[PDB]
Structure formats: structure tokens, C-alpha cells
RNA sequence: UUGAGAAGCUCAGACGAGUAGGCAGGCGUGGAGGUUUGUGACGAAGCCUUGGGCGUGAGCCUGGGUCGAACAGCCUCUAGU
RNA sequence: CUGCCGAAGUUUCCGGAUAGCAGAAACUCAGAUCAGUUUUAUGAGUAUGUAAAAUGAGAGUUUCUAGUGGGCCAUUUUUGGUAAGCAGAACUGGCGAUGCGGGAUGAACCGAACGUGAGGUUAAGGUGCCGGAAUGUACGCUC
RNA sequence: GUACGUGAAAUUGCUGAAAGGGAAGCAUUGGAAAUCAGGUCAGCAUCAGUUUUCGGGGGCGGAAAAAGAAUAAGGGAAGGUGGCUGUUUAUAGCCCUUGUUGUAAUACGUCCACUGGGGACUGAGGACUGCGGCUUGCCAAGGAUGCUGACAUAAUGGUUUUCAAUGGCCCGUCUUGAAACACGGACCAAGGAGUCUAGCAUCUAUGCGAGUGUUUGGGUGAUGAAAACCCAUCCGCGAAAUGGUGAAUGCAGGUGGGAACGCCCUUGUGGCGUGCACCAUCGACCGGU
């Protein structure tokens, strides 16, 4: 048994078999959608621009 | 943590080196503390677990 | 399995080139002081187990059979079952007429001869 | 299996997303947050046993 | 599935410098008992050889040459090994 | 001939024993004990000693039987000093039983510890030529 | 061919082959020449393992980059432009702040169970089991197969000599922490050093066992009779100790731990019973039991 190690992360068959999760994954999502809300305190960027 | 236990992966089975490359493996030897597969092995050392 | 060896050349004795009453047969330098004991830099091998050879292709020739010294008829039948393992290798002192018998019988039952042309021609 | 690899992935997006919107509020306001203390350390020996 | 020389077969992992010291398994030689329906003047032993092969090794087997009367494997015994 | 295990390198008492280090034999022990380790707590003087969590490892004894009882080098503390050397301890290190890469060469320097090999990647040191590898990039100094 | 069986090495002459610019031997890798055994060697593809080197796309993060651009306010000026050394955008422009275009882009960091190529090394195992994926089947899923070639009148693998590049301090002994000294070594062959015996002790084996030991001796042995076989009386050691006497009080004694076994039922665990060896315990009996 197990006359061979196969890497998860190169063979697609082995990780399969180790996570039955990986077919559904989706690791790119939008999250930052609808608009960016700038947010930064006046009082920080004072500071960040003192000195 | 998770390309470590994937690629680099070695569980202590019987005082030997046996790769972890099954779920049973993990289930036999970490079963008792509800660790039945790679990812629960994962979380339990990325978390921190009891 | 092709027949592979770890080392051809042999294990020649330190300083057998040298002298002519050091004969070439391996010995263990027991000098407390011998460099090729310390294995420096550049000094000819030892022999070692790691240099061993494989065990199912151990013992066995470049055709892959494994030779089985013959010295009559009686032990080239022993080689019947063993014809695709093992060939026969007829003795040094076996003389002329029994060899003629060994390789013929040898012939019959499908058995390698690795000097089947010796005094027989 | 399946469904625990679902719910740790969930917690690591849930808790990086936690984090992030934790020092923005911060950063908005001009007050400071200061990041969890790690509780894993990865460990690699450099040097030799001589 | 035949893979029970159970002293065998098989699976897995780790390991590998080594003095003093400790432990184990092997190679070789003279002789003895047993055995091989054993080898031999159609050539024993020995010797020689830029012939071949086996063993990690100690060593072993073999071709060719020379040679001319005896010698070997295996199991045990023994030592002026 | 091959393989396996493998020290001591010195206390403590009168050259011998005891012990230490290494094995063997025979036991009991895994709801147990250990540790060239670190925390916590107690006091006491940043350290100390005592006790009680972390991490690691199965942890214990009895018999009896080998070998060992040197030195060298270096750091730190300290004791004196002297034209200046150094001298006296302690301390644990390195060598010693140990090859290999580098330092042009080397008992003590930098790396690294060894079955036979293929591939990959590095340590230390290096990339003008000898010499494997940039007569590289950028900023200065020097005749 | 009596310088007489076999005829080793040291050593010598000859012939052949080759090497040689103040050592040589050796090791490694190949080439050449010579010589041996006698299936070999290639190319590609599709995969597996290890690995290296180029790209592409996309999340997320930070001052939710900084800038910047374009475009509206105000401010300031210069290393002062047009103008006239001095001044404030005019016939150049620049700096600062704000708005806007904005959810700008980009860099950097990080992630993708996102993706496309190039290179190298490896192919262990050997019916079927297993974990999985796609759907009885098929699969990149417990280790390489497929398709072709060429070549055997040679390629491969050797071996010998030699060359090239790289490395390589003379062996043993002794001394010291360690070297080096120093001593031994012209060369070859043959010989050449932990042996036999008595005692003691340990361990292992074998036989027997409160016993044990035939070989002083006798008997006996026709085929070697110095063997083997048989054993009367003794004797050795042991079975009794203690300094003359001379041992279960008590299942040849109870308690605890303990090998091993049995019965159970929460059944596993744990309980209960029995409890070898051995070790701590109260106990005895003889002058150790």
C-alpha cells in the first residue's frame, strides 16, 4: 500500500481523493464590489504626515 | 501550513514514518480527538485547537 | 529487472602495485595511521555492504541465469526445472566424452551451457 | 468531511475579513488596533549538529 | 496464487564515522568419518594466461596453454590451519 | 573477510576498590515516570535555591563484565601582577575514536559530520585568468 | 638429453607494441588501438515521480497605494518667463491646498483546490483487492506504457596498454595531547608466533535426577581385539546444619504485590476467586530447616 507518494498539490486525482471539498472552491470572488468607500481619518493622515 | 501537511505531510503511525496520504490514516491515529481528515488536521494546527 | 552492477572494477589491497609480496586479495588495513582506512583524499575505495548487489539480481550472469557447476549427466537433469533460471556450467576436469554428454543432454532439455564449446570441438 | 472543509475555509475568509474591517473602523477613527498575537510559530533549524 | 528449506515467506519505517572493548556471520588450508550410481591417461593435481563469469569481501567457477597420476563438492570431526 | 554495538578520556576512598560511561542476563513497569530544557509560584540574596505547567521521550530498577583513570587548545569570570611577557585557579567548549567543502598550503579558523549511486538545492567561501561561477548593477573613497 | 618429472616468483637477454622536457607507482572519467562476450542502440508520444525555467489571467490588501492625468477654486512664489537689477503669468511656466474626473490606474505585498509552455533525471513494483473521479464500464485513482525505426558483416557492455583532465606525501613500529624524529624495510619464494596440559570459575548444551559418575579393575570382544559392549565391591561429589548436639509448632504458617487461570456483568472495563517465581512482612524448628 502506497507504493508511491503523489503531491496533492500537482496531482489533481490525490487531492480529489484527500478533500472532497476542492471541487467546489471558488477562491476568486468579488467582494470588494458595488463602490470602494475611501476610509481614512483625518486625524491619521495628520499623524502619517507630521515629521 | 497547508502545502506542508500536503506535500511534506508525515504522520507518526506506530513509531514510523508513514505519509499521510489517506484520511484513514489521520482517522485511525487522530480519530479519538475528532481530526478525521487532512483539513481537519490542518485546521486544528492553523487554529490553534484544544 | 535488467542485471545491474553497483561497481565493476575489483578491490585491490593498498600498496599491492608497489610490492610484488603483496598480493592483490583484499585485506582490511588495521594501521591506526593508514590514510585509505581514513579515506582522505583521492585513496582507492574499501569494499563495503552499501556496494552489495541487489538480491533478486545477485548471483546471476549477464543473461540472467545463474550459474550451476556440472560434472555429469546426472546433474544436468537435475537443471530440468530450473532451465529458466539456472545454466550449466560443465567442470574444468570433466573430460572430453562426458562433456559431449553433458552439452547433448544439456541440448535436449533446453538447458544454457555456459562452456559448452570446451574440449568438445 | 466535506461540510467541516466548508466551515474552516468560511472561518478563515470570515476571520481575515474580520481583521480587515477591524483596522479600518480603527484607521477611520484615528484610533489604533493592534493586531491577535500569534498563537502558531513555524519553526526551521538552520545550523548543523556540529 | 501454488510464496511451509517456519532456519521459510512477506509488509512497513528508521538508521549507516568509529579507537579501547563487546557481539555475530562467513572465506580458505592439511588430515579423519560419512556421502556424491562424484571427477580422471579421451588427461587428475599443479602451473601459466592483454580469455570469460560470480561474490561488498575473504575467495570461487570457467576458456586456452603447459602438464602427466591422482582429486573434489556436500555433512560432520580434527589441527603443527 | 564482512557486519553490528561502541566508550572512558576521572570523580570519590585507601597501585586496589566503589562509582561513572558500554553491553549482556533476569525481572516490573505504560490511570509511569523521566529530562545537560523553558516557564509559574514561594521565599531569600539581575542572578540564587525550593516547589509546581510547557515540550520531548515508554520509563524503571537488580545482578555481572569488559575497557577507561590522560592531555592539548580556546572563551569567560577572577587572583596577582611586569618595562613587556605572563603566572594561578574555575567554567564549559574543540580536538581527541572523524572523513568531507572552504581558508593558496595547515593539529587546532569558517562550514559540515560519512553505506553504494542518479537528480535537484545549498553552507562556508567565492564569480578578471590560473578556476567551476557577473571584466554584474548602484553610490562613494584611494594614486 | 643425465645442467634430466612438474618448473612459480625475484631476476636477465631477445623480439614486438607503446610511453618518456628534473621521479614513478595509483585512483576517477572517457578517447584511441588491440582483443572478448555476441539481442543492442536510438527517436517520438501519452502518463507517473522529483525538479528547474519562462509566461498569461484573476481575487485581496496599503494613505481601500503614493503619484499622475484631466478639470474647477484659493494660496504662494521662484533656480524670475514674457515683459520692466527689480517684479508675480502676461507673449514660459512652477510650487501649496481643496474640489472633481473616481469605485482612476499602477507599483509592491499576498492568494488562486486559475492557466499556458520549455528542460533534465527516474520507471522501483508485478493477477485481483484500496482510496477516489467520470459514469456496467472508463480514469492521470496503491510505482511505464504505446507507436515505430535502424543495427547486427555494429552498436552496447567489457578487458589490456596508453594519453588527457582532476586528485593522490612511504609502509609498518614507537613516542607524545599531537606530530616529526628514531627504528625496521634491496628484491622474490618457502618457513615463521595465544599452543598442549592440570586446576578453578562463568555461561550454554546433553544425559540422568535425591541422586549422580561404566573405562583402578574385572568380564567380554573370531569379521583390527588398543574399539565397541557389560559391571562386583568401593570411592568422589550432593542430599544437614552449627559450633558434641543436630530441624514441619502452625494446609512444611498468615499479610501485600505478582506470572497464569476461572467465574461474572457494563457485558469492554472493573468486580470476585485461585495465586507459581520473586520481594518486602509478622512467625516459628536445629546448633540453617
Known sequence: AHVQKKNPLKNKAVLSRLNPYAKAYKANVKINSEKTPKAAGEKFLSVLHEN | ?50 | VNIIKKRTKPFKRHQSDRFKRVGESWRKPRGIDSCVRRRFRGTISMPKIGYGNNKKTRYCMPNGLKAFLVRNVSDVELLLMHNKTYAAEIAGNVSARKRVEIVEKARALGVKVTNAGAKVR | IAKRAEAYEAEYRAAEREQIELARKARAEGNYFVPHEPKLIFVVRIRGIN
Not at chain 2, 17 to 35: C, F, H, Q, V
Open chain 2, 1 to 50: 501550513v497547508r502545502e506542508l501537511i500536503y506535500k511534506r505531510g508525515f504522520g507518526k503511525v506506530n513509531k514510523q514514518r508513514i505519509p499521510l496520504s489517506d484520511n484513514a490514516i489521520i482517522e485511525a491515529a487522530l480519530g479519538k480527538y475528532s481530526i478525521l481528515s487532512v483539513e481537519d488536521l490542518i485546521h486544528e494546527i492553523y487554529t490553534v485547537g484544544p
